[PDB]
Symmetry: D3
Subunit: 170 residues, 6 copies
């Protein structure tokens, strides 16, 4: 199914296949590219869990050979393997032990969740929500030897849009 | 997998691909027929959640080209995308903003849940469950602009079987 | 599509029934790749382990080699755990004889299982719960029963897996 | 609060203080009568959970001095320590390591859940629920050293009402 | 034993029914202090907010002043949320007037609610869901109904609370 | 009920009233000893939740005026307000913004959970559990202005028992 979902349904939206639902315990899942199966990547050893629904845009390629990764801000978790129709609003800038690490910040389209309609940019998101996202990524690998993540900042909507465009065209 | 499952395993059962589990919060899921992926359709704005497991019968086309939809009465939710083996016992009749809408009422086979063995028709279901199904569909689109639902009535098992048969034939 | 083994020290296990997940028994259908509800269990019992099978395997029952993955947390149905076999559980039932592989996540998935090399490393009460589950879970199912006969060691598990892969 | 609740609100009702919710994992709770605190009794070692909401009737004393205990057949779990208004429909008769053991079977009053209104006797409950209640109690102490339970049979409504009345009179 | 107010800008709210917690309605019994099951609700609906009451208060119904606490998470029945009122929901039931205070946790419990000072600060879909719930949660209960007639401001709420304490 | 439960049932046992169940989301509860009610202390803003069942020994008085606090290592969460019968095996030593901060480390007695019979000292707990507990306390207040926690080390069973005895006798 992953090879036949489009990256974008229209000009304004992106399709994001969820791998890890918000607040759903210690399991990190990842889709295997060459089989389409959902693999357990890790039983996490902290008490932490994802601050948003996490997944990727199908039919995309980042610089690292992986699809473009997305954090979908939502009011509720969604099952792994399900697709949320979203719009990009910004990007989370990070660095891990192997270099640059960017995630798109997206919200569901208004036909899925009208309460996000007024959310157009990162500045419209709750400060504590953003602090919590930062805290999660800066700390979720603290007990994992060899691996770390540092947040460097945020990028705007235009940056999110160009990165997704670059991932579709690459 | 949707394009690989028969509508009926035998004369007396239907396969029902589940989209929305019973009593499982505000998420409304739907299979996209082109990709075969399960899409989030809506984060529902009411406090309501589905009174039965909800899905469709593969390899059927209803009147309007959509697969035949099913309410699987059960005691427990199942995973979205899992398939329940069922038998039809009736149909729920409604009207929505785009016209006539009908949903089959079904129960698992006795091989799956023996406790449903003696439920042969709608009248075998308790009154309050039927009332809750009606009240759900009448009200779950109350906060959704442009979209409404009104329940017309019920039809028996023979009406369900004819509806399923015409779905398989149309497919 | 998915290998039975990623390397010599590992098995891939597709989960059908998560540990401690209520009454639903699931089973993957080969031809469709769909997850079918097998039954709604009539007892108050749940699986004591994540339960599934090794892809690309075939045992004498005509089914793939099935596996009880000992774990600290449930995993969603249809997800794949990277594992290693440590033992086998031996059973008899109404259909003949039955064997389930006892596996644990690789140390890449869950470092806390690194010290678990054999069945003797599993805690006693876990093994008793496992035995108790299989001996009683079909109690309210007419015409079906299970009886646990014993355990098999690591090499026995590897042999059963090798044989499953060849067949 | 245990000390401030009547056994019976009216002639056809019992107040039931819940210790263990149905289907709520491996925790077995019990009210300490001296402190009024809810203690953890056991982290159960089987995979089993309670088939009904389980508790006792305040201001009753069974033949062995314990309060009269009750299985409350309901469609949903209730928080530990909460009180459900019920009517008795029967008794489950058992034998344990200490000796004779009896649990009243009750359902919520119609004011709390109208769907229980037509359940008057034990034969009105479905066969598989009764078999599951029996199966639970016969096996839940299987992994517990020195403790066992054996079901000896069921008693009707009149039997439950007598047992409750003797319970109040003994208190 | 619990005060109605910790200070001038705060009310203590004992929770009876947590938000999004299924069909059970609970009510505290004053004499025993026990949490009674009031109803197994027959709809698929659940409470849109944490629902409880201000201890040491008396309304016209003979009950304490009740309160819908806007929160991001459920809290256990019997626990106490430190709150502040921002408004009132005005309703009419089969027995007369039905008023309920709209409260938010204090900034010491949840800083994200600091900017919510009046009902206009609450998002409108939430307010629509609140109204929807109260207008339909008694639909399957014979002889009982509710009509929402409007909202009242913070001053209206503080007056209602002060009277409840005085009474 | 709080003022009716004993601190210790026998020589080998402590009674611990649970305020916060392990892995049970953002809600941080605390008993008000003046009223006996369970208050919400905080809606936590991180993705973290308690790694143990957390509560106190009733009828105890610490140096700081509060009951002796306990982290009960257990295999499952327990409802708030319920009492677990435990034995102390050690102490978590910490400092917060207002000074010394010790928590007892306990396990259920063998009559409640036999799988803890062999755990007699902190060395018997697995390393990752202890790393997770340390990590929780060092970070759970990161998003809370003016409050912090530093872990200084661990004390043995004797230190635990002395602290408990001091709390009962104070
Ligand atoms: Cl980790
Ligand atoms: Cl949009
Ligand atoms: Cl975090
Ligand atoms: Cl875009
Ligand atoms: Cl909606
Ligand atoms: Cl059948
Ligand atoms: Cl409804
Ligand atoms: Cl069964
Ligand atoms: Cl390994
Ligand atoms: Cl078991
Ligand atoms: Cl046990
Ligand atoms: Cl009644
Ligand atoms: Cl059972
Ligand atoms: Cl109702
Ligand atoms: Cl405030
Ligand atoms: Cl609603
Ligand atoms: Cl916080
Ligand atoms: Cl002990
Ligand atoms: Cl942590
Ligand atoms: Cl001690």
């Amino acid at each position: 199914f992953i090879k036949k979902i489009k990256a974008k349904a229209n000009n304004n939206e992106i399709n994001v296949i969820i791998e890890i639902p918000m607040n759903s315990g210690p399991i990190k899942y990842e889709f295997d590219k060459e089989s389409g199966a959902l693999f357990v990547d890790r039983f996490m050893q902290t008490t932490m869990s994802y601050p948003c629904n996490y997944g990727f845009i199908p039919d995309t390629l980042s610089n690292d050979g992986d699809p473009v990764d997305v954090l979908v801000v939502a009011h509720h978790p969604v099952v792994p393997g399900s697709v949320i129709k979203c719009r990009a609003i910004g990007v989370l800038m990070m660095e891990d032990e192997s270099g640059l690490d960017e995630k798109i910040i997206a919200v569901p389209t208004s036909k899925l969740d009208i309460t996000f309609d007024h959310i157009k940019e990162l500045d419209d998101l709750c400060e504590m929500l953003k602090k919590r996202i930062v805290h999660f990524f800066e700390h979720y690998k603290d007990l994992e030897k060899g691996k770390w993540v540092k947040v460097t900042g945020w990028g705007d909507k235009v940056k999110a849009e160009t990165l997704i465009k670059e991932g579709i065209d690459r």
